[PDB]
Design an enzyme around this catalytic site. Structure first.
Site, PDB file in Angstrom:
ATOM      1  CG  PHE A  59      35.152  24.914   3.115  1.00 42.10           C
ATOM      2  CD1 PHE A  59      35.640  25.458   1.925  1.00 42.10           C
ATOM      3  CD2 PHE A  59      35.450  23.594   3.425  1.00 42.10           C
ATOM      4  CE1 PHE A  59      36.438  24.710   1.075  1.00 42.10           C
ATOM      5  CE2 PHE A  59      36.248  22.837   2.583  1.00 42.10           C
ATOM      6  CZ  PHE A  59      36.748  23.396   1.399  1.00 42.10           C
ATOM      7  NE  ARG A 118      34.770  28.470  -7.297  1.00 42.73           N
ATOM      8  CZ  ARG A 118      33.522  28.880  -7.498  1.00 42.73           C
ATOM      9  NH1 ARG A 118      32.908  28.679  -8.659  1.00 42.73           N
ATOM     10  NH2 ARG A 118      32.885  29.497  -6.516  1.00 42.73           N
ATOM     11  CG  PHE A 138      28.363  23.281  -1.953  1.00 43.46           C
ATOM     12  CD1 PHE A 138      28.514  24.641  -1.727  1.00 43.46           C
ATOM     13  CD2 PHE A 138      28.138  22.444  -0.873  1.00 43.46           C
ATOM     14  CE1 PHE A 138      28.425  25.167  -0.430  1.00 43.46           C
ATOM     15  CE2 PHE A 138      28.054  22.949   0.407  1.00 43.46           C
ATOM     16  CZ  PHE A 138      28.195  24.317   0.634  1.00 43.46           C
ATOM     17  CG  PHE A 139      32.208  24.454  -6.941  1.00 45.19           C
ATOM     18  CD1 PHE A 139      33.066  25.452  -6.502  1.00 45.19           C
ATOM     19  CD2 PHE A 139      32.545  23.131  -6.709  1.00 45.19           C
ATOM     20  CE1 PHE A 139      34.239  25.148  -5.857  1.00 45.19           C
ATOM     21  CE2 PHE A 139      33.714  22.819  -6.062  1.00 45.19           C
ATOM     22  CZ  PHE A 139      34.562  23.834  -5.629  1.00 45.19           C
TER      23      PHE A 139
HETATM   24  O1  LIG Z   1      35.807  28.775  -4.943  1.00 44.24           O
HETATM   25  P1  LIG Z   1      35.558  29.736  -3.805  1.00 44.24           P
HETATM   26  O2  LIG Z   1      34.531  30.762  -4.244  1.00 44.24           O
HETATM   27  O3  LIG Z   1      36.829  30.455  -3.419  1.00 44.24           O
HETATM   28  C1  LIG Z   1      34.828  28.768  -2.419  1.00 44.24           C
HETATM   29  O4  LIG Z   1      35.806  27.921  -1.908  1.00 44.24           O
HETATM   30  C2  LIG Z   1      33.623  28.041  -3.012  1.00 44.24           C
HETATM   31  C3  LIG Z   1      33.153  26.920  -2.095  1.00 44.24           C
HETATM   32  C4  LIG Z   1      31.971  27.030  -1.433  1.00 44.24           C
HETATM   33  C5  LIG Z   1      31.587  26.018  -0.616  1.00 44.24           C
HETATM   34  C6  LIG Z   1      32.387  24.887  -0.481  1.00 44.24           C
HETATM   35  N1  LIG Z   1      33.553  24.793  -1.154  1.00 44.24           N
HETATM   36  C7  LIG Z   1      33.929  25.792  -1.950  1.00 44.24           C
HETATM   37  P2  LIG Z   1      34.282  29.882  -1.031  1.00 44.24           P
HETATM   38  O5  LIG Z   1      33.524  29.093   0.013  1.00 44.24           O
HETATM   39  O6  LIG Z   1      33.396  30.958  -1.621  1.00 44.24           O
HETATM   40  O7  LIG Z   1      35.544  30.497  -0.449  1.00 44.24           O
HETATM   41 MG   LIG Z   2      32.717  31.873  -3.571  1.00 48.45          MG
END
Ligand SMILES: O=P(O)(O)C(O)(Cc1cccnc1)P(=O)(O)O
Ligand SMILES: [Mg+2]
Ligand SMILES: [Mg+2]
Ligand SMILES: [Mg+2]
Length: 339
Positions: free
Chosen positions: A183, A323, A80-81
């Site tokens: 999310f 990150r 997912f990341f």
């Molecule tokens: O780490 P990020 O990019 O701040 C994020 O939480 C990455 C992410 C995506 C999906 C699920 N959990 C984390 P986001 O959704 O883009 O705000």
């Molecule tokens: Mg993101």
């Protein structure tokens, strides 16, 4: 030392961290999985993977999960990341064709993962192998619900690609509805059930105590991430963040939205503490005296416990993971761990 703009005393005081006993091997297998699925290049896995804490995040949430359940959960979470990083990299280079093919490959692989274990696109192949292992734990009604939830998650990501491309920052209420989906609130809620070994009947998992606790758990995680990723996301030209919707649609200062964000995160916790008591009373009601009653009670009580675990895992994750350390990058707009 969590910075005070991010410090949450109720979290540190009343939500002590937990760690799954399997985490040490979990961390290594996932790093190797990332290496062998070629989801990241060799030198950035060796340099960045461990310090991204993606296995720590999940080892601190899904307590009690079977090691192989946890292992599949953590590979998909690491997947997912990077999908988020590829999604952001397509946007930054206007690769609207590539995003659209992948998005349709992802839609397809989700229903037929076996047929995609060896797809040419490495990102589609990795996802197919984690989802395939995810599908082996519980009946195909769980598997179908997982697919239904992820189908909407992909579509939400497609709404983001067109939001950042056309310059639209969502409104606050439009964002709160979209943020449950980007999310993947309901994916994480679904995966509580292989972690405790039990598909829940619709009547159990849709009880208002279960549903409200499950929701407040994800709203905190999604909104604390917004507080904590806001610097990274401003620098990366991201527009999908509660902080950002409040600034462009309610004319709030940077420091004013951050407090409104912090304040909304804080109320997530105290609202959870209330419905947590309802959800735990419901677990004890389920133990009516029968066999299936005892099991359903234990599964609800483990899942609710892991709803509570999510707060501390996510909280400490956002201060330990590389990150979000935008301050340590030569280029604040390109995290060194994405391609
Ligand atoms: O780490 P990020 O990019 O701040 C994020 O939480 C990455 C992410 C995506 C999906 C699920 N959990 C984390 P986001 O959704 O883009 O705000
Ligand atoms: Mg993101
Ligand atoms: Mg995102
Ligand atoms: Mg974010």
């Amino acid at each position: 030392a969590v910075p005070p703009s991010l410090r949450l005393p109720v979290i540190e005081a009343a939500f002590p961290r937990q760690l799954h006993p399997y985490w040490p091997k979990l961390q290594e297998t996932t790093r190797t999985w990332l290496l062998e699925k070629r989801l990241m290049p060799a030198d950035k896995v060796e340099e960045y993977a461990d310090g991204l804490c993606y296995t720590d995040l999940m080892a601190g949430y899904y307590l009690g999960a079977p090691d192989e359940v946890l292992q599949a959960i953590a590979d998909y979470s690491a997947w997912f990341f990077v999908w988020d990083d590829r999604h952001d990299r397509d946007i930054v280079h206007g690769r609207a064709g590539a995003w659209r093919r992948l998005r349709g490959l992802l839609h397809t692989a989700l229903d037929s993962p076996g047929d995609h274990l060896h797809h040419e696109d490495t990102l589609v192949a990795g996802f197919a192998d984690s989802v395939r292992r995810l599908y082996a734990f519980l009946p195909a009604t769980w598997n179908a619900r997982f697919a239904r939830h992820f189908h909407t998650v992909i579509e939400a990501y497609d709404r983001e690609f067109h939001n950042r491309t056309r310059g639209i920052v969502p409104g606050v209420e439009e964002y709160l509805e979209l943020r449950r989906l980007t999310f993947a609130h309901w994916i994480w809620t679904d995966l509580l059930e292989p972690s405790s070994g039990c598909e829940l009947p619709d009547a159990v998992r849709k009880h208002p105590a279960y549903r409200r606790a499950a929701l407040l758990s994800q709203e905190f995680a999604a909104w604390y991430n917004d507080l904590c990723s806001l610097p990274k996301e401003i620098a990366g030209d991201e527009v999908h963040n509660l902080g950002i919707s409040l600034i462009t649609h309610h004319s709030l200062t940077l420091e004013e939205a951050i407090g409104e964000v912090r304040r909304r995160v804080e109320e997530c916790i105290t609202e959870f503490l209330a419905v947590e008591r309802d959800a735990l009373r419901f677990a004890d009601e389920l133990a009516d005296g029968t066999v299936r009653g005892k099991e359903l009670s234990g599964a609800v009580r483990a899942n609710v416990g892991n709803m509570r675990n999510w707060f501390s895992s996510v909280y400490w994750f956002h201060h330990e993971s590389g990150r979000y350390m935008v301050d340590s990058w030569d280029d604040r707009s390109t995290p060194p761990y994405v391609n």
